[PDB]
């Protein structure tokens, strides 16, 4: 259940900001 919206958007947003 690593499929988690909080976990996935956290990484995507971090990439968007990086």
């Amino acid at each position, epitope marked *: 259940s690593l499929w988690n*919206w*909080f*976990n996935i*958007t*956290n*990484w*995507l*947003w*971090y*990439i968007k*900001k990086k």
Partner: antibody
Amino acid sequence: QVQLQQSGTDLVRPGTSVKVSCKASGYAFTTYFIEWVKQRPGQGLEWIGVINPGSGIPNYNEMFKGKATLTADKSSSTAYLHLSSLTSDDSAVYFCARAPYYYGSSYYYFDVWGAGTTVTVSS
Amino acid sequence: DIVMSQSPSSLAVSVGEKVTMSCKSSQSLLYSSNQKNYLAWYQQKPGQSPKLLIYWASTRDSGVPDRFTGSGSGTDFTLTISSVKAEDLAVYCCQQYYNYPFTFGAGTKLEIKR
């Protein structure tokens, strides 16, 4: 020089709502997570939830879903904890904490804590 | 939810002696990929806010004196004060950041033996 400044004590009647603020300074507000922890007098620490201040998306402890609401105002670098339907059980000290954001992950320790906000519920 | 057990709840220590504190998790904290334990140790003095001492079970936070040491892996973890000082009297609690919801231990309260 990292600092988490929380608001003062709240004396509220049961059934009302309260909003605790946590103002950050000394770093980029949106590059760290904001955690909220509840501690009842003479008891262990209780994790409430966490919010990504940049994306705005929170993650809640199931026990606090419906009672706690997490927001963040990027313009003022301030995180908020909203508590509804207050009762005697909500009387506690509420800490806001900061957690790093390395590699886009949130599973991190809490490196900086605020002074805590005392909330007292009584009629 | 992971359950953090800390024994004993209170401990009477003498200044200069080696102190050991135990923390047990109901679930393993060792991530297989990076082989890192998602375990932290905090110090909380009466009336003050928690202060971070050890993270990754054994990594010392900056500024923390070298007399604090974390050990263990998986489910059994340990905090050691090689030579306790008077200013070390506080409650020490462990925390897992391995799985939501993050959970803390009840803490171990340090007091002066007499």
